[PDB]
Every structure is written in structure tokens, then in C-alpha cells.
Amino acid sequence: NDPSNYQLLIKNLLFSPVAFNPEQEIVYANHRRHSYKTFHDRVRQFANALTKMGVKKGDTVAVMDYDSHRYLECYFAIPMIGAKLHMINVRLSPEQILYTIDHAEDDIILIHEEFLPILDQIKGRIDTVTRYVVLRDDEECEYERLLEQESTEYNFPDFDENTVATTFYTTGTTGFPKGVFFTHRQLVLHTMGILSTIGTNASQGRLHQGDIYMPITPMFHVHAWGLPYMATMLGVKQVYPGKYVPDVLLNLIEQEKVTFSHCVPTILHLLLSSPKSKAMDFSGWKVVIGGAALPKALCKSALERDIDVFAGYGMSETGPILSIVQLTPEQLELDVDQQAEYRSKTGKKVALVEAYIVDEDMNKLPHDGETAGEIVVRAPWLTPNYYKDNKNSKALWRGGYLHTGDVAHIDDEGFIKITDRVKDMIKISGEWVSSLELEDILHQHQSVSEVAVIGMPHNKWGEVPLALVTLKEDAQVTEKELLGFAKDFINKGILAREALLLKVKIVDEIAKTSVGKVDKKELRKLHL
Amino acid sequence: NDPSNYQLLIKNLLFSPVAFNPEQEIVYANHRRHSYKTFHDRVRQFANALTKMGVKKGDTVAVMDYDSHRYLECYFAIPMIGAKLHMINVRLSPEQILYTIDHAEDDIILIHEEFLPILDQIKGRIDTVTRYVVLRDDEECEYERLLEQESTEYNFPDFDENTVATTFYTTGTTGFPKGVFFTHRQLVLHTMGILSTIGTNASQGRLHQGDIYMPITPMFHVHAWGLPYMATMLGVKQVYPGKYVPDVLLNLIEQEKVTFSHCVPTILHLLLSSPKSKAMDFSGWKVVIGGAALPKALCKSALERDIDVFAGYGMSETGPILSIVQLTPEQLELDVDQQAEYRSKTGKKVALVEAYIVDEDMNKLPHDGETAGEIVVRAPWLTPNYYKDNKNSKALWRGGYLHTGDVAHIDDEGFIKITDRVKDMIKISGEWVSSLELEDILHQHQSVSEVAVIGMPHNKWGEVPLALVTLKEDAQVTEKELLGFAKDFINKGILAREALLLKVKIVDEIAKTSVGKVDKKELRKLHL
Amino acid sequence: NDPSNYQLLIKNLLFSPVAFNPEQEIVYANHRRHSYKTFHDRVRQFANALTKMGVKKGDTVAVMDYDSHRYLECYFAIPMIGAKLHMINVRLSPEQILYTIDHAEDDIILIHEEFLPILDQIKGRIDTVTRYVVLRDDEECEYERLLEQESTEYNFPDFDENTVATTFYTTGTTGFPKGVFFTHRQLVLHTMGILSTIGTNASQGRLHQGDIYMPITPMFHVHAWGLPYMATMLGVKQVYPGKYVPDVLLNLIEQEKVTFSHCVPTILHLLLSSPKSKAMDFSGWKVVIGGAALPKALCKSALERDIDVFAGYGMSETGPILSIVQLTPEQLELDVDQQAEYRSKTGKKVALVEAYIVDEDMNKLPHDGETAGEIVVRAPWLTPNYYKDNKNSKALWRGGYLHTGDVAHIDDEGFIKITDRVKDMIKISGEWVSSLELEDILHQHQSVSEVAVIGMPHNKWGEVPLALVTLKEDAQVTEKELLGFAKDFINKGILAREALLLKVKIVDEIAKTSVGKVDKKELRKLHL
Ligand SMILES: COC(=O)CCCCCC(=O)OP(=O)(O)OC[C@H]1O[C@@H](n2cnc3c(N)ncnc32)[C@H](O)[C@@H]1O
Ligand SMILES: COC(=O)CCCCCC(=O)OP(=O)(O)OC[C@H]1O[C@@H](n2cnc3c(N)ncnc32)[C@H](O)[C@@H]1O
Ligand SMILES: [C]OC(=O)[C][C][C][C][C]C(=O)O=P([O])([O])O[C][C]1O[C](N2[C]=NC3=C2N=[C]N=C3[N])[C]([O])[C]1[O]
Ligand SMILES: [Mg+2]
Ligand SMILES: [Mg+2]
Ligand SMILES: [Mg+2]
């Protein structure tokens, strides 16, 4: 090629990092410890092993494990050869896993032992896959046995920076999972642009070279929010817990002295409510809870335990990271509650992100902080389209912009506050209300446990909300009282307070997606 | 173009920054203050004004001023239109300035009033230049008068990220100045990769969003080491001093509370030895002295005044920044003197930089910390070649690598220590000694003020060093004593200690380059 | 390549000439004589020697000598290999020579011994040049020593006819010398089109196969007006004088019986006024004085000595030859003075030349013989542009035509008469007068030796002429008498006879260009 024409490749994130201490440790929880030198040696050994299998530049290798050093080595060796890395969402149903495997046309499959029963239900219908490698936590692992037979020397090639590196098949509301892919250039730009925006903070929520990293996210969802690529560039100590057990997670955090991690609101609540956390010192921890809609009460409870809690925002199609909550030095004086309300927002855009707010006609509503609209974005690390799709790709990049699909209002200071989802919007009459505030209102009820609000067509008012509630243990309140519970609230538009047609219903169970989210579209078949 | 195909442009560094406070100030010393909103308005106004002159996408605009808000607006508006920016080295002789102006084929020239006498000696022979704009510090400036007539609205175009943005004509040892150019992609990658490597430090020498920036470098040398582009991305307060007067510089630092700056070893020594600095509080300052060869004694003297002093390294062809001294937390315990010896080194490579050490055959000598060799580099922000040159371009990028031209030894920990220059090397016999250590040795003499060491051919030993010294006031020591002064030292190779042919000579004055450096090549005509 | 696709190459001018006598002599004055067979052998030997040095097809070889057989062999061997030939103007200042050498990026330099002191002032700053070959007039010449070691056999390649062959850096009024280049096709077309236009004359001023050739021009100015290429195509005897000494030139002309030559008006005047020319028979000589503005009195004096004197016209950018004075048979009956006035004109265009007369708007003024305008031309042997320049190239080929830069009026018979230069024009008010006629008028003064006329701005009349004169030995006439001297003349327009603001000044010395021409632009700095 051209030596003066530099190419942004993943291999430059490992051999040309910000810092490199050869004696820094990679730790797999109570199973393995090894320095960075041996980590590089193992990456070269895995590259040699993959070359021995016949994995060419255009091939695809699919991984099905937990979080471990094996997944970190796969995040590097497979893209550096040239082949694509397919992160398989374990939490999907086996039929969806079969669909993704056949769609991506994988060649090798690295599957953990605990996921063997799933593959038994599907291996029969799987084609195009030649070799299965079984990963174990003991000395009889096939990955280790294939590493031991290779050498620690390899010459990684130089190719175009626009070669695809990863794919993970997100699964929104489309009927089938949609495949999103990224290149070497996009991933390098992502890690650079996030390290330049969160490392430069003054005193709050910064990731520097003295931190100790831990992922508490599935790490196959989306590149583990890109953080494993950043942590290895800073050359920091990394700890991988494995199966996400709170009893083990707290022990690892206290013992390995973890200072930076990221999780979801349910995992954080589980960690806080554990009784192995009442005498545990948390005043060194920096959780970025960017899963979905960090609650204010949970943020306040975490802040009472001395924890640097701040939310983030991104999706499978966007790198993922698009916005991160960063507090200016004069905002950290606020109190127990005004800090909770600032930290739980969506956050300000990160560097090299545009993030306008538009209407169904693309009209770019003002950022007054009151009017809501869809978020449309432009960034260096957005997927160009869906894999093998064309009409969903056009819907994704309509109007020369990527459509996120979330309805939010941007404050004048730049703070974003996600209000609801586009498909979950209530276009009653000519206004667009959100189902999240109604869901929050009928949750404050002392007898309701889980609530869901969906739309119901009305000839003279378009479509109107419908309320579904689940009662608590030995709690029986009639629908009329539940209606009157929301009828006391104030400060909303439409007829009176849009309270003449709530139409609440009591349902014993509400359908859920296997991921663990409320399934409104399935709900909209059962009742209408 | 393609909306999904992102282009790394300079305009994204201004409208998509890491932080943006509209009320943050840009200050031109005791002359002007204005917020960031008015700074953006003035950038748009200057874009409109340049469009009115007929400045097209391929044109070139040349600037000849000091450091001011005008130079910051030129760093952005001119590249964002598409035209090239020519930073003219004021300190060059008028003949060299004429050569650079005619070589670059400029169209507009922005020249400060104080540089008018230079242009009088040259305007006669200048062609291809149509309009001259005279910049003044009062209200009658033509730049301000041309800004006032335009509007604060502009739509900046989108073009290829490989379009040239800047050029500044470095002037090494070639007979004529050599032109080096960079693109939008290279500058954006430079600012991202340096913000991601110096902002992420734990506690020492980090540039964050709470700092206040000041350039104490000519700011036309090389992009002011890229720091003005970084400071505006963090949205920090910026102060521009103008003419570099220590009496004014100290007042500005104390009054504007500057916390981050960069200068050269002579300017720092001038600031420290000023008597307006004996009662001045310096324990908030972060000077990066990356000009040339930060002395150890000056570093110790600065450290005694509570100043975060650390050296950097780069050149005109390399972005510029290639290495920065970063101290790990266990290295800050050391004492008054071991910290001085760590801070004055060349430093470790920055992220995305290779920086091997080679020999005349390209053989990649080991990094044992003792063997010296030339530094060869690969980085995302290196100039591909010299402008309108071909044979010097091949010499620059020989062997698939950029040749820096400096002889250094890399320590095993990664610390670099520049020893000498390639053209200043002494290949006596079969060994290569450096003239800098001999220069340092005969400087310790109580009677010598300035010393210069050059080579002298010897039939049986190739070429040998020759010593030139300048005596102090009313000091007269014969050459024999000066010879014997170096004959006491030990710990060197070659015959005894290479002390049988020093050949010291006493010269009243030593030729100097107009920039302010010792001219050895001119010296090598007068005496041999 | 394609054998049926003929390419016009320089090698076809030597091996396929109009005539070829193997026993015809090439004579270097009192130093060397050798036939055409040995000339071809030496050309092949020099091609072999250049190949041995590593001179490739794209290389450049620069020559710095007088006129000799060596320069004739360089005119052929270097272009026939494929490399470019750089004729270096010796008469330029060493700084300009350095600029041209660095601009052309020469590889080999053939320099005569007498020019060694110049190279001593510059060799230090010269890069890209590897080998220096020193030419001498004795047996110890390095050119001869390198010829003797090669063989007289070579196979010259066939390449595209559009490959550059020569470059010589003209130096007009631009601040720096401008490089003009020509191809094989252009040179072959030039020699063909001039041999077909001057060989076909009836009885006056024709170059045929019976002539004996001599160059009395620097021969590096512009291809020696292309005449060495023509003389070798006719296979005529060629004599080269060397250093241009009139005592030697007259002896060579009388002894070698030279019948065709070309010089400049100063050299011809020197030859005529020599007292070794009073008994010398000149009635066989055919001087083409095409240097600059052949005077009428000198032409008459030469005609009184039986010499076929006629002027020519061309420039560095135009081949050079564009027009030659050719007299029809009925024009040779005229007398002592009407023949002088016909022979001293610019001449009629040569074959394949357009040569219109235009105004500042390109409006193609009529050829009535009274109205003056700029000459614009189209010809097969014009340089397309300046080397490494773009804005001067557009000024050169403005309006789809090459602009010569001389103001002349074309007579209806086709005779051209150059009046002045464009930059030396006086646009007083709305008319354009010429400074040459005013210069001629104040020269007739018995006390004035050298005169120069330049423009001086006037608010109500634009710019007006200013007269500078130099008095003779022991001659002191006041400015008023000099004014009144021009006030007696008649037959001109403007106010009376434009005689109310002559503004004559007496200056002891007038600045001159090192070439030997009046420097008006430098004059226009000293006084205004
Ligand atoms: C700081 O780093 C991060 O937080 C990266 C988070 C990446 C999450 C990716 C994921 O959740 O992919 P998808 O299944 O497509 O998720 C899309 C939806 O996730 C919701 N979301 C994410 N973060 C949110 C915050 N802070 N508030 C509300 N909702 C959030 C969005 O609705 C998004 O469409
Ligand atoms: C018959 O062959 C020739 O005479 C060829 C002459 C080639 C001359 C080239 C040379 O003089 O290159 P430049 O320095 O650019 O010269 C340009 C100016 O020379 C003046 N000139 C030439 N011949 C002239 C005549 N006959 N009359 C007036 N002026 C003449 C021109 O001004 C031209 O621009
Ligand atoms: C951090 O940042 C920084 O520092 C940057 C810097 C830049 C600079 C540039 C210049 O200087 O260009 P030029 O002129 O080319 O230069 C070159 C040279 O320089 C020197 N240096 C620098 N630095 C240093 C040095 N030395 C030693 N040390 C240090 N540190 C070198 O030599 C080069 O070559
Ligand atoms: Mg999504
Ligand atoms: Mg340099
Ligand atoms: Mg000319």
C-alpha cells in the first residue's frame, strides 16, 4: 500500500495505545490472571490458530460466551485478521438465534459450555458452520488447547480502514432481527472521540489511566458500549466477573478495588439492595447507567452511598454512545435532589455529534426545552444501513439523517430529556402525548405493581390511551378508583386534563419480551 | 454527497465540540473581550467577507500577525471555506519571505501594521497577490471594518476530508524553505488523538475543561502546536497576549488566572528571571516547554517555584506533536532532582505513533536505552511530502517511514532521549559520537559563554570534532587550558576518551541563523 | 510501439537529415576539428556515458559552458536518451542560478572550469545534484576522459513525441526566473518550419547547404535561436568560437570562411569598429541580428561593408523565432537608406504563425500600419505554460492566445514594427505613447550619453513620463535646455506635442540589470 496513507485500524488501538504497562493485569474472576504482555502473546496465538482453521479475510466468526478474557481477545484478534466478528445475543429465543446465524453465514462458532443446550435445539437446522469450539472455565477448554499449539508471533496485515469488523443484530420492532455493522475506522473514531470527551472533564465522571475497569453489561449487546476498546488503550487494569452474580460482583469490586464500571438500572438496584453491601465502601465507584431510563429515586439512593452515578445514551445503530451526562463544577454544589434530577437526564451530545430535534416533516423544532420531537443524528460511528435490507435502511436514513426513534425535548443548555418512543406516542386529536408519564402516574398507586399504557383508536379523536394494570398481593381496587386516582393530577393539556377516557383495565399478567421489556405490540393484538 | 459518509472536517471542531459555553470569553490582551457566541458570529462574518473578495475553494490566504483573536478566527474561517491558510514565518529574512509568498502563490495577504516595513522591501517583487489587508490594534483596523459590513449567517460547505487546510514553510537545511501541508482529516485526528492522550492523565500535566489557555509560542510556527484547535474544542477561556512582553505576560497570567500554556526555554527563563515574578504565585501553571532541548537546571528552577513543567517533542513535518512527557503516579514522589531528570526527557510516544529507532540501513536497533539511532515514525498527521518537490520528498519518506533527522536512544520503559542531530553527528572511525555532550562539557568552563562543535575531516579517522568557543568579559584563557579542561572528564569510548584531537579555537563571534540558532553549516564554510 | 505511427523526435534530425557528408568538419576554434562521422560516434559515446551514470528517462542534466562542440553534442545526446536538458544562463547572478538549479532539480551538472568560482559561492546550498563534471579546453577534460571509456554503439529508444527536451529559465519581470520548456515535436517542427521559410528565398538572406555556420549568441539563451539544430540538418560546416573575442572572431571568419552567423547589435558594432576589420573582406556574410532592436545607423554602416544584414524577432517563450525580415526582389534596388529602413524592421511572420495585434480587451485592431497594440500569437512551437506556476501561466495564455508583451503596429504589407513594451507604455489620459521615441529624441542631444524614460503618476492625467539623462565627459547642460531640446520637435498628439511636463532629471548612473539592460522597475522604486 502507501506508507504515507495512514489507515485507522483496530490493530493500532492495541500496539499504539495511550499507555502500556507490560505488568498490568487482566483478571478473569477467581479463574485467571495474566499481564498485558501475555495478553498480546495470546492475541497473536489466537490469530495463528484462526489462520490455521482457514479463516480468510472475508470470513465471519461468531461468539457465544459470557464476559471473560476470551471475549476481549476475540474483540481484537478476529477484527485484526480481517474477518468479521458476530456477537450473538444469548438472551434471544433459539429461533431468533438460528435466524441470525443463518443470516450472517458464520463459519466458526465459539460457544460456552452453558449454552450447549440451546445449540442442541438448533444445531440440526444450522448450515454454513463447519467447526464448533467449546469454551470452558477449567483446564480442558478447547480455546486454551488450541492456543497452546500456536506461536506468539504474527504479522497482522494492513487493509482498507473501511472493512467491516463487527456485527451484532439488534432486534427492535421489525418482525425479524436487523443486522448492524461497523468498520475499523468507525470503532477507532468512536474510542478516540469518547476518550477525548469523558477524559477531559474537570472532576466528575472522568475515565483516566489510574482507573480499574469492570463491565457489568452483557458485552455482546453493543461492543460493551465500546468501553473494552477504551480500557485497553489507557492500559488500565481490567476485571471480568463472568456470570453476573451480585455476591461475586461485590466481592470483586471490594477486592480488586474497581473504580469504573457500567450497568443497567436493574443490576444497580440488585447490587444496592444486596445485604452484602451494607458495610461495603462504595466511595470510589463511577457507574455509567446508560441502559434505559435511569430512575430518579434509584439515582438518589445511589448518591446517598457516595457513588458517582451518571447516565448515558446510545443505541445499537449509533456506535452506541451518543450522549453522556457531564456536570459542570458549579452543578456539583446542588443538593441531594437537584443533583439527582441532573444526573438522571439523557445528557449532552458528545463530540462530533449533531443531534437535532425534528417533527414528522423534518422541520427542526427549537431547543426551548418544552416542545418534544424525534431525535435525528449525524455522527462518525453510525451504521450506514441494515445488513441485506433496503427498505428499512431507507426508513433509517430518511432525510439525510439517522432516525433514532425516540421522542425527546432538548433544553437550551444542551441537556436532552428523552420523553417516550415514536411508536408509543399518543396522537390524540392534534397533540402528541407520551405514555411514559401516564405509566408513571398510575404506578404511584399503592396497589399497582406493573402498568402498561397503549393506544386505542377513536373515530372523532384518532387514537386514545388505554391503561393496563396488575394488582399487588391481596389487593383488589375497582377500575373506578384507579380512574379517579389519575383524575386528581393537574398541569396537562387537552380536554380538562385529558381525563374523560382513560379506560383502565386490570390484567393478571402483561406480555413481556424475552429480553425483559414490556411488549406493547403483542398487547395490541390481544385487546385490539 | 452521502449523508451517511462522514467527513472529518475542521468545521466539526467548532460546531460539534466537547463543550460549549456561550458566555465563555476570548480575550485579546487589554484590547478586546468577547464571548464564544460573538466568536462564532465573527467567524461567519469573516467567511462572508472572504466570499465577497472572490476567495474560491482552491485559493490561498496568507497571514502575517501576532497572536490575537484575529489569528484564531483565521485558523477556522479560511479552512472552512475550502481555501488554504498560509502561516508566514515573520522571523525569516525578507528574501525568504518573498520566496515563500511566490512559491505558495497567495491571493490575499493579512498583514499587521508593524510588519509593513518588511513588505516595503518586497512588495515590488510580489506578484499573484491582489489585495492587502492591514490589521491594527485600534478601531481603524481594516479587518474589523470588513467584518462590520457582513452578516453573521453562513452555510459552510461539505467537501472531501482530504482537502489541504494549512501550509507554513518550514526551513531546515536545504538551501530554500520547504513547504509542508496538512488536511482537514489530519488536523481533526491530531486534536482528537492528543486530547485523548493528555486529558486522560491521572493527576499530572492534564488539559481539562476547567483550564484557561494561553499561547506563548509564535502561533505561526506549526499550528501553535495544535493547541488553539484543542482549546476551542474544550470551550475553555482563551487569552492572547500579543507581542510577548514578560511584563505583560506576567500581569496577564496573574490577572486572567492562566493555568495552561506552552513556550520555549528562553521565554520561560525570561519569565522566571523577571523581577516582577518574585512575589507572583505560580502554583497553578502547566507549561509544556517543547521548543528545543529543555535544560535540566531550568526545569529544576521552575520546579522550585511550583510549576508543572514537562517537555514535549514534535517538528514541522509531524503534526507537530509526537511525544509528551507524562509521569506515572509513583514517579511524582521523587525528589527535587530525579523529577527534573524525568521531566526534561523527550517523552513517550503519543497514541497512534510508532516511533522506532533505526540505523543508516534501516535495521531497527533495540530499545535498550544505550544504543543511539535515528527516529523514524508513522502517524496519522504526517505531511505526505514537500510542496512542489520530489527528491527531498523521497529522502523524507525513505524506506516507507518518515525520517525525523534526530539521533536518540529509546529506553525500555518507552522514554525517549534525543541525543543529537543526524547532520551534526561525528562518525569518527566507526563510531558515532554526539556534538551536544562535547558542547555541554566545554560550557561548564568558567570563561566560556557560547560554544560550537563541528566536524573536521581526517584521512585516517574520517572526520573529527573541532571546538569553537567565545570568551567572557575580560577573560583570556589559552587554548591549551581549554583542551585540558575536557581532558579531565571520563566515561567515554574511542582512543582513551577521544581526547588527543579536540582542536579548540577561540572565535569572537559565532554565526547565527536569523531564527536564533547556531549556524554550523555556514561555520563549515568559513573554516573548512 | 506502432511502427506506422511516426513520432517527431530529435533523433530523426541527426540520423535522417537533409544532407549528410561524412567528411564535413565540426571545428572548435583552434582547439579541435573532427568530421561528422566522429561527431555521431561521440554522440553515441556520450549516450553510453550518461547511461552509465544512471541518467534515466525522466532525469535532468544541466550544462554551464561556452560554445563548443561539447554543447552541440549535449544538444543531441541528452534529449535523445529521454532526459531533459537545462541550459543555465551564466550571466545571471549566482543567487538566481541557485534558484534555477533548485527549481529544475538537476542531477548531473556539466560546468566549464572558468565557471568554478561561481559554483564555489553556491555549491554549499545546492541539493539534488550528485555528480559534477568539469569541462576544460586541454587534454585533461573530464568530459573527454568519460567519452574515451565508452563505445561508439548505442540504440536510441523510441518514446512519445510530447516528451520534454529542453528548459532554460527565462527571467523577465516577475521577481523570480520563469521556466519555459519544449518537446521533441515542437523543436522538430521549429527547425522544419524555419528551414522551409528562410531556405526558399530567392536571392537574399537564405541558408542553404553550401553555407558555413557560426553562432555568436550565448547558445544557452534560447536553443541558440534553434540554428544549431538546423545547421546539422543541412550537414554544413560548423565553427564554434568559444569566448567571443572580436580579435578571434574576425580571424575565424576570415580563415574558416564563415558565411552565415547571428549576433546582437552590440557584438556586431564591436566587430565593425575593431581595427582588425578595415582590410577584411565581409562580402560573404549573412548576419541575422535578432537580439533586440537593430538600430538603423548600425544597419547602414554594416550595409556599407557589403554585409547581408537583416533582423529577426522571437522570445524565450516562442521557440524562439516568430518573424524574420525577408526582402522581395524589387526591394533590393532601393538605396543606401531605404534598404536600411526595411532591414531594421521586425519582419514578417514566419510560416505557421498567426501574429495578430490586439488591445487590452482583445479586440484585434486593424493592420493599417499606424495603430499600435500588443502582439498575440499562435504557433506550433510555443511553451504551454511556465514550469510549476499557475497564475503567470494564465496571464501568459489569456484569451486563448500567447501574449508577447510587446506593443507594435503591423503594416498592411505584413511588416511588423515593434514600438515599445507593454509595461513601458505611457497611458497618459486616454492615449498610449511609447517611451522609446522619447528616449531616441533626448539621445540626439550632444551632451547626453544614456537616457531612460519612466512614468510618473498625475492625478488629472493618470501617469506621465519622466526623463533621466546621464551627461557626457565635462558636459554640463541644465535641465531647462534639455527640456527645450525636445520642445522643438513636432508631429505628435496630446497637448501641443505632449510638451508641458517632460520633467527631465540628471542622474550620474542609471541602474542596470546584470544581463546589460536598463532596469526601469528598480528605477521606479528609487524615485517614486
Ligand atoms: C454511555 O454508554 C451507553 O450508555 C451506551 C448505551 C447503549 C444502549 C444500546 C441499546 O440499549 O441498543 P438498543 O436495544 O437499540 O437500545 C435502544 C433504546 O435504548 C433506550 N435508551 C438507552 N439509553 C437511554 C436513556 N438514558 N434514557 C432513555 N432511554 C434510553 C432508547 O429508547 C433507545 O431507543
Ligand atoms: C531570428 O532569430 C531570432 O532573432 C531569435 C531571437 C530570440 C530572442 C530571445 C530573447 O531575446 O528572449 P527574451 O529575453 O524573452 O527576449 C524577449 C524580448 O526581446 C525583444 N526583441 C527581440 N527581438 C527584437 C526585435 N527585432 N526588435 C525589438 N525587440 C526585440 C522583444 O522585446 C522581446 O520581448
Ligand atoms: C508538545 O508540543 C510540542 O512541543 C510541539 C513542538 C513542535 C516544534 C516544531 C519545530 O520546533 O519545527 P522544526 O523547526 O522543524 O523543529 C524541529 C526540531 O526541533 C527539535 N526539538 C523539538 N523538541 C525537542 C527538540 N529537540 C530536543 N528535545 C525536544 N524536546 C528537534 O531537533 C527537531 O528536529
Ligand atoms: Mg435501537
Ligand atoms: Mg523539522
Ligand atoms: Mg520573453
Please state, in angstroms and rounded to a whole number, the distance separating the CA atoms of residues C243 and C253. 15
**Ligand 2, from C315, C323, C346: best to mutate by most atoms within 8 Å of Cβ?**
C315
Q: One of B123, B417, B427, B503 is an active-site residue; which one?
A: B427
Q: Which residues lie with the beta carbon below 6 Å from any ligand 3 atom?
A: B 170, 222, 225, 288, 290, 292-293, 311-316, 320-321, 324, 346, 405-406, 418
Rounded distance between C-alpha atoms, residue C213 and residue C233, angstroms: 12
Longest dimension (CA), chain A: 75
Evaluate: CB of C376 within 6 angstroms of ligand 2. no
Q: What is the DSSP letter of C487?
A: H
Residue A221 alpha carbon to ligand 1 centre in Å: 11
Is the dihedral angle over the CA atoms A120, A124, A129, A131 positive or is it negative? positive
Rg (alpha carbons) of chain C, rounded to whole number? 24
Cβ contact C234:C211 at 8 Å? yes
Angle between helices A227-234 and A69-81 (to 10 degrees): 90
Distance, in Å, from the CA atom of A128 to the CA atom of C102, rounded to the nearest integer, reads 63
Nearest of C17, C75, C73 to residue C43 by alpha carbon: C73
Provide φ and ψ at C279, rounded to 5°: -115, 20
Residue matched to cell numbers 475543561 = B209
Q: What are phi and psi of A396, to 5 degrees?
A: -75, -45
Ligand 6 centroid distance, CA of C464 (Å): 26
Query: Is C125 in Cβ contact with B391 (below 8 Å)?
Result: no
Of the candidates B304, B305, B248, B260, the one whose C-alpha atom is nearest the C-alpha of residue B281 is: B305
If one counts every other C-beta atom within 10 angstroms of the C-beta of residue C61, the result is: 23
Residue B384 Cα distances to A4, A279, A350, B224, B398, angstroms? 6, 60, 31, 20, 12
Grid coordinates representing C245?
573575442
Determine if residue B315 is labeled as part of a ligand binding site: yes
For residue B385, the chain A residues in CB contact (below 8 A) are 4
Of B329, B380, B414, the CB nearest to A210: B329
Measure in Å the smallest separation between the Cα of B19 and chain A Cα atoms: 8
Q: What gap in Å lies between CA C475 and CA C469, rounded to an integer?
A: 12
Query: How buried is C227 (Cβ within 10 angstroms: 0-12 exposed, 13-18 middle, 19+ buried)?
Result: buried
Catalytic residue among A37, A300, A417, A427: A427
Neighbours of B, requiring at least 3 CB pairs below 8 Å, are A, C
- The alpha-helical segments, DSSP class H, found in C383-434 are 391-396
A406: annotated binding-site residue? yes
Distance CA B79, CA A168 (A): 39
B203 contacts in chain A (CB < 8 Å): 210
CA–CA separation, C509 vs C469, rounded Å? 9
Cα distance between residue A403 and residue A405, in whole Å:
6
Catalytic residue among A170, A183, A217, A383: A170
* Strands A164-167 and B402-410, bridge-based pairing: unpaired
What lies within 8 Å, CB to CB, of A73 at 6+ separation is A39, A42, A43, A46
Q: Which residues of A touch B227 (CB under 8 A)?
A: none
Cβ-contact B36, B235 below 8 angstroms: yes
Whether C520 and C452 have beta carbons less than 8 Å apart is answered as yes
Q: Which of B252, B250, B253 is nearest to B278 (CA)?
A: B250
Question: Which ligand has its closest atom nearest to the C-alpha of B264?
Answer: 3
Q: Which residue of B has its CA nearest to C528?
A: B124
Residue in chain B closest to C125 (alpha carbons) equals B175
H/E segment holding residue C445: none
Contacts of C125 in chain B (CB under 8 A): 175-176
**Contact (Cβ atoms closer than 8 angstroms) between residue B273 and residue B302:** no
A293 annotated to a ligand binding site: yes
**Chains C and A are in contact, defined as 3 or more C-beta pairs closer than 8 angstroms:** no
CA of C267 to the centre of ligand 2 (A): 15
Q: At what angle do helices A246-256 and A265-273 cross, to 10 degrees?
A: 80
Sheet of B108-112: strands edge to edge?
Answer: B131-135, B108-112, B60-64, B84-87, B164-167, B181-183
Residues touching ligand 1 (Cβ under 6 Å) are A 170, 222, 225, 288, 290, 292-293, 311-316, 320-321, 324, 346, 405-406, 418
Q: A404 CB contacts (<8 Å, ≥6 apart)?
A: A315, A317, A318, A374, A375, A376, A377
Tell me: is residue A312 an annotated ligand-binding position.
yes
Shortest Cα distance from A400 to chain B (angstroms)? Answer: 5
CA distance B273 to chain A (A): 32
CB-side neighbour CA atoms (13 Å) of A470: 10
Nearest to B380 among A6, A18, A202 (CB): A6
E strands present in A43-130: 60-64, 84-87, 108-112
- Which amino acid does the sequence have at C443? H
Residue A417: which H helix or E strand, with range? Answer: strand A416-421
**Closest listed residue to residue B189, CA positions, set C479, C216, C44, A191:** A191
Ligand 2 contacts CB of residue C408 (under 6 A): no
In order, the DSSP letters of A133-179 are EEE-SSTT-HHHHHHHTS-S--------TTSEEEE--B--SSSS-B-
The C-alpha cell at A514 is 424475552
Rounded to the nearest 10 degrees, how much is the dihedral formed by the CA atoms of A99, A103, A107, A110?
-40
- Are C175 and B125 a contacting pair at CB < 8 A? yes
Residue minimizing CA distance to atom 1 of ligand 3:
B312
Kindly give the residue spans of alpha helices, DSSP state H, lying in B335-491: 338-343, 391-396, 435-441, 479-487
The answer to whether the beta carbons of residues B275 and B304 sit under 8 Å apart is no
User: What is d(CA B512, CA B523) in angstroms, rounded to the nearest whole number?
Assistant: 9
Chains that touch C (3 or more CB pairs under 8 A): B
Q: Tell whether residue A432 is among the known ligand binding residues.
A: yes
- Burial class of residue A179 in the structure, from the number of CB atoms within 10 Å of its CB (0-12 exposed, 13-18 middle, 19+ buried): buried
Nearest to B102 among C127, C176, C521 (CB): C176
Class of residue A129 by CB neighbours under 10 A (exposed 0-12, middle 13-18, buried 19+): middle
Entry resolution in angstroms? 2.8
C314 C-beta closer than 6 A to ligand 2? yes
Do B202 and B329 form a contact (C-beta atoms < 8 A)?
yes
The three grid cell numbers given for residue C456, joined into one nine-digit string = 510618473
Beta-carbon-side half-sphere exposure of residue C505 (alpha carbons within 13 Å): 16
Catalytic residues of C: 170, 317, 427, 432
Helix or strand (DSSP H, E) at C269: helix C265-273
Of A18, A200, A349, the CB nearest to B208: A200
N-term to C-term CA, chain B: 61
Name which of C194, C170, C144, C165 is nearest C80 in CA terms: C165
Q: Which of B199, B350, B380 sits opposite A200 (nearest CB)?
A: B199
Measured CA angle at C145 (ends C140, C146), to 5 deg: 145
Strands C373-377 and C402-410: antiparallel
Question: From the CB of C261, is ligand 2 less than 6 Å away?
Answer: no
Distance from CA of C393 to the nearest CA of B (A): 11
A65: helix, strand or coil: coil
DSSP A181: E
The H-assigned helical ranges of A276-334 are: 296-303
C-alpha cell at position A314: 446510545
3-state secondary structure B136-198: CCCCCCHHHHHHHCCCCCCCCCCCCCCCEEEECCECCCCCCCECCEEEHHHHHHHHHHHHHHH
CB contact under 8 A, A352 and B402: no
